[PDB]
Amino acid sequence: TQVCTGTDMKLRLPASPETHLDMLRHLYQGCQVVQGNLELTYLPTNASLSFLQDIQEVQGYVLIAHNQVRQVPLQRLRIVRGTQLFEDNYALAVLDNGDPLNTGASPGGLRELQLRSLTEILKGGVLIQRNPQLCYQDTILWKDIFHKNNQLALTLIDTNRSRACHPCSPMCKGSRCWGESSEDCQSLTRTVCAGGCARCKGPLPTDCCHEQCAAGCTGPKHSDCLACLHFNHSGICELHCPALVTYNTDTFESMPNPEGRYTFGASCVTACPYNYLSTDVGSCTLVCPLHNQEVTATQRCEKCSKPCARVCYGLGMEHLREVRAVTSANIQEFAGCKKIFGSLAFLPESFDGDPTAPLQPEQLQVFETLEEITGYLYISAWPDSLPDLSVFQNLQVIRGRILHNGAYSLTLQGLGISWLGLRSLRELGSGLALIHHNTHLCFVHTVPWDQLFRNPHQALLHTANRPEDECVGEGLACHQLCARGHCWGPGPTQCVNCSQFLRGQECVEECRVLQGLPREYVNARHCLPCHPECQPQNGSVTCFGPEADQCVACADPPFCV
């Protein structure tokens, strides 16, 4: 809500960097901190980055590379925790932020970092290599930002530099300039501290700071802290959140503890937010762990009345963690799976010999069964012989916890289909939408994506597809009876809230009652098939209830025969 989530790009190459540019204004605008890795790549001088004005914390590896900007408005950031690390080693890295190719007055890269607000680090190092055109590196003695731990967590810095530097500001103690301005001086919290004291605003024990606290403090008291180690408990720096329950004196007799709080994203809170999980263990997370499955009550994760229930898993799971994508194999592994516990995606590597075996169109339609997934999606190619993707005639929701490149609920690009028909959607969990490079595609802007969203951060970036202004060619349009034009494709089947009544999947005027041979009755704006035994009638409606009872046209006492 008031925060954003990490990502998984690793020197990744997105498409249409104008979308990459809009890829994050919906993510980080109104965001305080990140739950994972922060990844910045491929950005020219042109940059509307004000939304990054207010950032304070990180949980995973930060990353910049192949970025050709002259400034970054990153300030007020004072924490990096490094739960995830570049190459499983570094907390933050920088590489090849310049231009080796071609009037305009500019260097072609970045000159200075300017990150005075940074004061605390946890597990992880830093790398900065092959980063020409920038100065004020090797300037501030990173060690004084590290903890008493990770003193041996090495780093590495670039020396091959093009342009000359400037001496640090005279208003700064030594040579600690993130930037030439005094506004980029430095304070530290390692050496000057009171002996074993971890952090301090000054060598005074009165200036010393609490152990669990970090980044210094206006005073060693909790409220006066600056960087709470593991959470900001209503404005407090405590080590662990209060337990949910408590056991009695010396008895196996538990009882709830109202002051208890679930563990999540450095925030002791009452309940778990949407898209997340609840556990008797006491942690909101994105996975229901070992010997522990999911139910509702809105989601929760606890054991059932049986060993681990046997269900279908998707990619990224306990046995599909290092998978690339789908292939000839593990396709019928989704046979009639009502609900998958993973993710999936399609690439050309599937539609190619892979000497193994490739895939085929007809070995499909299993997705007429699926009713829910846990992860994300991603597509790259698709055969021309398949006009649409009706195979998904009915899927309820994505509910994508894990995301592609740590950001997308789904992805699709590089195809040649004409339209789409994912009609049974009313909701979407975390993750961001994305689409482009779909030549024949139409009926795109016939969708109220905002409705499907459940997180305000979400949006949709779309381009490189035939627009409505030209799709109307030959007379394309949302179906007639589909309310307010909320179609996914042609035919009434693709409706959502069609005021007229439907047959299984066909909204039309006539729930033909008595004027169609297989008679019908009505319920919930939907047509239903009359009973078999109830003989055909022709005066008025032939049936009155689904079952054999509540009938009229008889062909045991209440039944027909």
């Binding site: 009755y521 005066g539 008025s540 409606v541 009229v552």
Partner: protein, 212 residues
């Protein structure tokens, strides 16, 4: 000898501002040789002479029909007021004086609802549809139908009756023929309801939906 009475206003027109009810004084059975007549409208014995009289109409009785309309703002009828149609002729030496007016007692808020037909009453042909009201007072009331906002005309109804509850009660029939527009909606279970109008009604109106 001959005799003549008047006609009261219509509840559908009363209790509705834009509508204009009509206190009406019909006259019939003119004399084959002494038919003359003229009106005078009084209020508790107070002449106004502001009515709109209409021409005549012959009948199978070899006589003529006469009548005049009287204007209403509803107030005086809403709070209570008596009217009087003064007529005359030569066949009768006496004038006319009738104390027709609204009545008063303990007004009862209409207890209202909807109900379907019976499974066994389905048969084949013109099915019935109904809508009932009870616990209302007085008997001056008339209602109509509505369907998804649209009206219906093939309906009929019944007058009220007294019981031990000191109120009134009745229902309204709605013919619904085969292969017709009356039943197409019903089978498709759309918004049917009963548009009711009555004095004791909160805001002088209520309503009750109906479907399967």
């Amino acid at each position: 000898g001959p005799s003549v009475f008047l006609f009261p206003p219509k509840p559908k027109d009363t209790l509705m501002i834009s509508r204009t009810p009509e206190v009406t004084c019909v006259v019939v059975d003119v004399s084959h040789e002494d038919p003359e007549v003229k009106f005078n409208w009084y209020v508790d014995g107070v002449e106004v002479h502001n009515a709109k009289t209409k021409p005549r109409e012959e009948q199978y009785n070899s006589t003529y029909r006469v009548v005049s309309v009287l204007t209403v703002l509803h107030q005086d009828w809403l709070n209570g007021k008596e009217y009087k149609c003064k007529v005359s002729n030569k066949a009768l030496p006496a004038p006319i004086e009738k104390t027709i007016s609204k009545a008063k007692g303990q007004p009862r808020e209409p207890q209202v609802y909807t109900l379907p037909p019976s499974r066994d009453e389905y048969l084949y042909g013109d099915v019935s549809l109904t809508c009932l009201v009870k616990g209302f007072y007085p008997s001056d009331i008339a209602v109509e139908w509505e369907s998804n906002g649209q009206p219906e005309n093939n309906y009929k109804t019944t007058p009220p009756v007294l019981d031990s509850d000191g109120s009134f009660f009745l229902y309204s029939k709605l013919t619904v023929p085969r292969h017709s527009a009356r039943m197409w909606r019903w089978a498709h279970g759309n918004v049917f309801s009963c548009s009711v109008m009555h004095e004791a009604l909160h805001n002088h109106y209520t309503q009750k939906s109906l479907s399967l």
